[PDB]
From a paper:
In this work, we engineer EUGO, a VAO-type oxidase, to catalyze the selective dehydrogenation of 4-n-propylguaiacol to isoeugenol. Similar to VAO, EUGO is active on various 4-substituted phenols and contains a covalently bound FAD. The oxidation of 4-alkylphenols starts with a hydride transfer from the Cα atom of the substrate to the N5 of the flavin cofactor. Consequently, a p-quinone methide is formed and stabilized in the active site. This reactive intermediate can subsequently be hydroxylated by the base-catalyzed attack of water, or tautomerise to the dehydrogenation product.
To shed light on the effects of the introduced mutations on the enzyme structure, the crystal structure of the S394V-EUGO5X mutant in complex with 4-n-propylguiacol was solved at 2.9 Å resolution. The asymmetric unit comprises eight enzyme subunits forming four compact dimers. The overall three-dimensional structure of the mutant is virtually identical to that of the wild protein as revealed by an RMSD of 0.49 Å for 526 Cα atoms. The pattern emerging upon investigating these stabilizing mutations is clear: four of them (S81H, A423M, H434Y, S518P) create a better side chain packing by presenting bulkier or rigid aliphatic groups, whilst the fifth mutation (I445D) substitutes a hydrophobic residue with a charged one on the protein surface, and might contribute to overall stability by preventing protein aggregation and/or exposing a more hydrophilic side chain in direct contact with the solvent. The sixth (S394V) mutation of S394V-EUGO5X promotes enhanced chemoselectivity towards isoeugenol formation by favouring substrate dehydrogenation over hydroxylation. V394 is located at the entrance of the cavity where the substrate binds. Notably, this position represents the connection point between the active site and the wide chamber located at the subunit interface, which may comprise the entry passage of the water molecule which is used by EUGO to hydroxylate the reactive quinone methide intermediate. Therefore, a reasonable explanation for the higher chemoselectivity and reduced hydroxylation featured by the S394V-EUGO5X mutant is that the more hydrophobic and tightly sealed cavity of the S394V enzyme may hinder the accessibility of the Cα atom of the p-quinone methide intermediate to water, limiting the formation of the unwanted alcohol side-product. Specifically, careful inspection of the electron density revealed that the substrate is covalently bound to FAD in two of the eight crystallographic subunits present in the asymmetric unit, whilst in the other chains, the ligand was found to be non-covalently bound. By comparing the subunits with covalent and non-covalent bound substrates, we found that covalent binding is associated with a 20° tilting of the bound substrate.
Author numbering:
A (entry chain D), B (entry chain A): 2 to 526
The structure:
């Protein structure tokens, strides 16, 4: 049928749509079923339809965002703000609440407002992609570098606002985010930090401004629609070298983590954000599943062995990058070589020492860790026909026993639900994201429903072991926020009071992070 | 006269006090004029008395804080929460609103709950002073170091909660704060980050947890009473060396800042938070005003020259610390010498090469920058009889012109109001605090009132040049928050709805950072 906002008639919605068209122009409101299918979750989860958009609106300016918000308030139309809407693995551009309108800020608000060489920052509109920014930096011959995630088509703004991560020293995007401009849920515009002081040049210099520090409350949040964002850019070091360490055994995970933490916590010699990818993760990047195993079932141990031998990779594959003058890079690599060399079967390769298929991932990490955005890692989705992923990412202490327990808990459930377990340990200073990508056939309703049920079990089971996810998909947001229920759901109750204060009509992205406004609370979604 | 909360009778206040005694014990509630005088602002601003506490309550469990907040809600008693209450230059323990009850959490909640060597963090109760933490690190022979402000008698928690600053690479206290436990304004307890997930080991490992990031909203805020807070501790490097660069001329400020920025933005070779102190600031630390000038009125040029000659300092004095193996320190120091050496009159001294009276500041900075707390800088308040200070701290871009333009704006007003202008530029990566201390005779109303009117003009004047302060005194919080009025006071209105949602009875520290709850708005308060 026609997809409508909850409790909005065909009559009110057509009226709301015409008002939208009056603000942004006829060409920049999408509302037909055929055109709207590009904005559904490319990696859908569950058998039944979920997260359907009623319309897509593409404003050009802050003021247009204001009027769109003002219209939504009058007609009770829920608004789902996105930038480039490439949140793939977490719902893409699809809104949490079926029937919501996508506000695609990125389509036409895509200008690089400023790139300041002296102070090393960028002021961006949501539409500026990692590729967009890299092209700017290269063309203007910049000494600065950006920090990208695995896929470069994302928004520097959009990624920050869901607290996504990169892999250079500037990997923590929210940390380096400096100032923003947001349209609050009833259409008022506000600037944070020094942007709040008229005429200040310090908007991108000093994050905090004066009084309570709000910026964080607009990340993984439904408290507004962001129209501008500042971020800090690191200067490109004079040289760099990337390396791979293959580890033969599954049980090697324990010592890898335990050896890694002393080398990582002081940001030297492990300067970048190290990643520890399993053989499944790496194999999927360069090959199809059917190359190794033709059956329907958890892959047998001999099949795993073929992947390792043929790709010349270990069960665990450590990828790092070193920066600075060659002598410093030499000393740091020397230290890494001999800390990790204490593990039987460890083998060491630099980005200059491997041109084979197996070294494709090392060559890609070398680009990502040097602020060169890539799409090469889209090849993962060729693992199986109509390939999709969901991201189940629990946060772990950098401890080999915690890491082993998590590895074994997840592989256990993946085998049960007949999904390949692909893992990438992203290592911060004192914490670790255990990235589990589950790749499945999107066109097969049982794969979708198996993915949904399996991850709901893993959310619950991880919680009973004392682990939470940093970020999750539309389908798991209620299940994930339910796990942060210390003091009888104290945190959700806190977020609920603020959402109802700023958004009294419950307009902005209802259900985001399991945070529902009053008019939707207890309403079976 | 007995000091009472606004609109609360003696009978109703006596009842509230007795209820407080039933919770904390009668010996931990102070309500008599004589005992309350210790809790006045030690550095009072303006002639008329202001910021008078009605009572002081010292709970020693979260459970007691909850009960006290619930009582305050019943009786409409305003609560001002403090840790050690040593916020000197900004009001000390004194509440913004006259009549408020101080909740001194630090008196009895003063336990180090954990210090973890492996992950390098501490979980602290508000009462733990920098001296307390240092003592612990030393007793247990820890490899970690803390990051303290200039005065070590404050709270690690309390300092963080006002976004205070230290001078080690971990100088950004809020940045390294990881998890907290807060009592919300109606008595409910909440844990943030991974603390919100029951049984998680990652509370002090991963700050963000899931969904919106709230921790910042409890800094320079009146949204609750913090009972526990995590902070990361940096590993003590193998060696360190501290240095002083004296610059002879006032006008040298420009080239110093311009030369500093390239050396600072990459955290090397300026690894430390550098401070640039003027000859007044350093003179005050080791000598009284009457050693140079027994006159009344701004200090003459020959007196300024005598200070420089006698202390063997310049007008501007640069104080840095270098960390790591001696070869690394030696190369960094080499770079700093020929960069700054381009300024005519620059001179260099290491902490090992100066034991004269002028080098006390250098010896004190060497302590502070290595995580060794100090009170040596209390000598600053002997400048004049009954000395107190206020902190006027505008944020400045690391631009020589901008630093210069501020320097003259402030000195201009200081001379007009017959206050000596003492400056310490604290230099972050891409931003500087222009710390302006005004030292004055707290015992004469003219001096107090001259300080109040001068800092009001300097707030207003700095705003018209596009500069805002990062932190301010009780007396200036409305004037300061008034300057951040982009979008027609957009920022304050946002804060106000959050305060009103979480605090419908307007209990917690009304007027903090110029943020008043409903019942006080437009009330000459
Ligand atoms: C499939 C996949 C995904 C992936 C990845 C590898 C693969 C194979 N590697 C990632 C990585 O290394 N790091 C990372 O952070 N994410 C990674 N992903 C996930 C995803 O592809 C990327 O994170 C991607 O960059 C996110 O998409 P995009 O950048 O386009 O973000 P968005 O969809 O526009 O917005 C994300 C959410 O933020 C909120 N939002 C966005 N804009 C606004 C505005 N203007 N106002 C308010 N809220 C906004 C919304 O919640 C939105 O959904
Ligand atoms: C006079 C002076 C001051 C000074 C300084 C040098 C001199 C000569 N050098 C400083 C420095 O280098 N860095 C810095 O950050 N401050 C410096 N100061 C100022 C002062 O000495 C310190 O900032 C001091 O550490 C602050 O006092 P303290 O640490 O005792 O903080 P507090 O009074 O306990 O609390 C501060 C405010 O935070 C809120 N607060 C505190 N505790 C709580 C709890 N538990 N819950 C909720 N809110 C809390 C209040 O708003 C309180 O006013
Ligand atoms: C190959 C890395 C994938 C990846 C990294 C971080 C993420 O948050 C994520 O979410 C879907 C996926
Ligand atoms: C002598 C340094 C003083 C100092 C440093 C940081 C501050 O915030 C401050 O405020 C009063 C004072």
């Amino acid at each position: 049928t026609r997809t409508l906002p909850p409790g909005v008639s065909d009559e009110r919605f057509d009226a709301a749509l015409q008002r939208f068209r009056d603000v942004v122009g006829d060409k920049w409101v999408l509302s037909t079923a055929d055109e709207l299918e590009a904005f559904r979750d490319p990696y859908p989860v569950g058998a039944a339809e979920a997260n359907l958009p009623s319309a897509v609106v593409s404003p050009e300016s802050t003021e247009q965002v204001q009027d769109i918000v003002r219209i939504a308030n009058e007609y009770g139309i829920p608004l789902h703000p996105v930038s480039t809407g490439k949140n793939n693995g977490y719902g893409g551009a699809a809104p949490r609440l079926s029937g919501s309108v996508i506000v695609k800020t990125g389509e036409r608000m895509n200008r690089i407002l400023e790139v300041n060489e002296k102070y090393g920052y960028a002021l961006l509109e949501p539409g500026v992609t990692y590729f967009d920014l890299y092209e700017y930096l290269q063309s203007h011959d910049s000494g600065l570098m950006l920090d990208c995630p695995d896929l470069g088509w994302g928004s520097v703004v959009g990624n920050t606002l869901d607290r996504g991560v990169g892999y250079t020293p500037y990997g923590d995007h929210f940390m380096w985010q400096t100032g923003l401009e947001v349209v609050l849920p009833q259409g008022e515009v506000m600037r944070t930090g020094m942007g709040a002081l008229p005429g200040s040049d310090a908007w991108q210099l000093f994050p905090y401004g004066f009084g309570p520090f709000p910026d964080g409350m607009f990340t993984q949040s439904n408290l507004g629609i962001v129209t501008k964002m500042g971020i800090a850019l690191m200067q490109r070091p004079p040289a760099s070298q990337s390396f791979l360490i293959t580890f033969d055994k599954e049980e090697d995970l324990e010592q890898i983590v335990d050896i890694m933490l002393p080398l990582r916590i002081n940001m030297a010699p492990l300067q970048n954000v190290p990643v520890l990818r399993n053989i499944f993760m790496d194999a999927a990047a360069v090959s199809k599943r059917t190359e190794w195993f033709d059956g329907d079932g958890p892959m047998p141990a001999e099949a795993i062995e073929r992947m390792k031998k043929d790709l010349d990779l270990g069960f665990w594959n450590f990828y790092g990058t070193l920066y600075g003058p060659p002598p410093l890079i030499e000393m740091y690599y020397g230290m890494i070589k001999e800390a990790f060399g204490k593990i039987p079967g460890a083998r060491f390769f630099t980005h200059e020492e491997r041109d084979d298929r197996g070294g494709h991932v090392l060559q890609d990490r070398h680009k990502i860790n040097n602020g060169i955005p890539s799409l090469d890692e889209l090849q993962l989705l060729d693992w199986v026909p109509n390939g999709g992923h969901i991201g189940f990412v629990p946060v772990s202490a950098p401890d080999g026993r915690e890491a082993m327990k998590q590895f074994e808990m997840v592989r256990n459930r993946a085998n049960e639900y007949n999904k390949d377990y692909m893992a990438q340990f992203i290592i911060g200073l004192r914490e670790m994201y255990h990235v589990c990508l589950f790749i499945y056939d999107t066109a097969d309703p049982e794969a979708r429903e198996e993915i949904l049920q399996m991850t709901k079990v893993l959310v619950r089971e991880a919680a009973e072991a004392g682990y939470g996810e940093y970020r999750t998909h539309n389908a798991l947001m209620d299940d994930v926020m339910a796990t942060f229920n210390w003091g009888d759901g104290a945190l959700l109750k806190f977020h609920e009071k603020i959402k109802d204060a700023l958004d009294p009509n419950g307009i902005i992205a209802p259900g985001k992070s399991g945070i529902w406004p009053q008019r939707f609370r207890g309403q079976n979604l």
